[PDB]
Design an enzyme around this catalytic site. Structure first.
Site, PDB file in Angstrom:
ATOM      1  N   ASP A  35       0.786  -1.207   0.000  1.00 44.97           N
ATOM      2  CA  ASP A  35       0.000   0.000   0.000  1.00 44.97           C
ATOM      3  C   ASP A  35       0.833   1.280   0.000  1.00 44.97           C
ATOM      4  O   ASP A  35       1.328   1.677   1.054  1.00 44.97           O
ATOM      5  CB  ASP A  35      -0.890  -0.029   1.237  1.00 44.97           C
ATOM      6  CG  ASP A  35      -1.832   1.155   1.365  1.00 44.97           C
ATOM      7  OD1 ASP A  35      -1.938   1.903   0.372  1.00 44.97           O
ATOM      8  OD2 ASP A  35      -2.467   1.337   2.424  1.00 44.97           O
ATOM      9  N   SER A 199      -0.902  15.780 -11.851  1.00 46.49           N
ATOM     10  CA  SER A 199      -1.161  15.398 -13.233  1.00 46.49           C
ATOM     11  C   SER A 199      -1.413  16.676 -14.046  1.00 46.49           C
ATOM     12  O   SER A 199      -1.926  17.665 -13.524  1.00 46.49           O
ATOM     13  CB  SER A 199      -2.344  14.452 -13.332  1.00 46.49           C
ATOM     14  OG  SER A 199      -2.766  14.270 -14.683  1.00 46.49           O
TER      15      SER A 199
END
Ligand SMILES: CCN(CC)c1ccc(C(=O)NN)cc1
Length: 330
Positions: A35, A199
């Site tokens: 994770d 992004s």
């Protein structure tokens, strides 16, 4: 040193991925959920509340000659889906894919929430976010990656998750046969303890790319792609009959649909998520309403590039003095 381990979807939907991990002497192998969105290595164990274990493999420190109680240490964590776990802590030898850390904090669960109990295929979590998020008190502990880092050939690990198929976690090297083209690296903020990046935009299907900054985290422990409501609405508007359902808890679409792809930007580069990656199947067994793999982050407080996005790329988690994130097509 290096390590290389195969990661396998737990079910037909790729709800999560498990990777075998060796703990203790003689080895005890547990299948852990790696994770990159948390920083605790915790396991189901001989200390877990008996009624809360349902098929998991447990760690038994009393059977390990190298286990040592980390006296006084406790831990308690809760995740964004509301699941949680807590317990006490041992140090022990932990190996992943051939790579060994001695003295690793192994957090032994005394209590786990129902969601964990129900996932018989997940024996615990291995956190790969930054150690500043580790929950052990009163002495915060380091992640497996942090501990291994000075021994590694290169201070990196890579995530190469498969779509309905096994993938690989590598430590200490970049496998140049595992991707196509070049790797585009992008800056990371560690301020919140995550692999947090920005992004450069998105496109829906064959649509034009929208240049827009979208701050989010690279999180292998989250199944879906969670993005701003504007972006998610633009996506699902291209799917006949898609809608946001408050009773279901997100966007659903007709299971008869063919989904458009979703492109996200990494600098001037582009990663394309095929439409099929966004199909998470009937909302209930036999239903003709399917759950979408792209969901709104509104009310989470962060955008999350979960497995839906990450499995479309070869991803480099660069843990150099200035950490960065790399994405390549594959
Ligand atoms: C059953 C609950 N599980 C196992 C699939 C979880 C795993 C990882 C996370 C998480 O938030 N990771 N960042 C949350 C929940």
């Amino acid at each position: 040193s290096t390590g290389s381990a195969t990661t396998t979807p737990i079910d037909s939907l790729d709800d999560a991925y498990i990777t075998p991990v060796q703990i203790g002497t003689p080895a005890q192998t547990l299948n852990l959920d790696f994770d990159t969105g948390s920083s605790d290595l915790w396991v189901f164990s001989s200390e877990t509340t008996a009624s809360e274990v349902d098929g998991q493999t447990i760690y038994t420190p009393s059977k390990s000659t190298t286990a040592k109680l980390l006296s006084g240490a406790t831990w308690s964590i809760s995740y964004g889906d509301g699941s949680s776990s807590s317990g006490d802590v041992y140090t022990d030898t932990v190996s992943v894919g051939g790579l060994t850390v001695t003295g690793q904090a192994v957090e032994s669960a005394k209590k786990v929430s129902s969601s964990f109990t129900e996932d018989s295929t997940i024996d615990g979590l291995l956190g790969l976010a930054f150690s500043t998020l580790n929950t052990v008190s009163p002495t915060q502990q380091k992640t497996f990656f942090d501990n291994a880092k000075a021994s590694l050939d290169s201070p990196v690990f890579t995530a190469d998750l498969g779509y309905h198929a096994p993938g690989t976690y590598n430590f200490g090297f970049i496998d140049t046969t595992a991707y196509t083209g070049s790797i585009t690296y992008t800056a990371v903020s560690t301020k919140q303890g995550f692999w947090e990046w920005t992004s450069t935009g998105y496109a829906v299907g064959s649509g034009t790319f929208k240049s827009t900054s979208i701050d989010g985290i690279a999180d292998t422990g989250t199944t879906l792609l969670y993005l701003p409501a504007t972006v998610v609405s633009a996506y699902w508007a291209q799917v006949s009959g898609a809608k946001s359902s408050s009773s279901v808890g997100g966007y659903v679409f007709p299971c008869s649909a063919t989904l458009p792809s979703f492109t996200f930007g990494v600098g001037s580069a582009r990663i394309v998520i095929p439409g099929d990656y966004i199909d998470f199947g009937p909302i209930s067994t036999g239903s003709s309403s399917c759950f979408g793999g792209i969901q709104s982050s509104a009310g989470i407080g962060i955008n999350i590039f979960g497995d839906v996005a990450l499995k479309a790329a070869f991803v480099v988690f660069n843990g150099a003095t200035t950490p960065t994130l790399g994405f390549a097509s594959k």
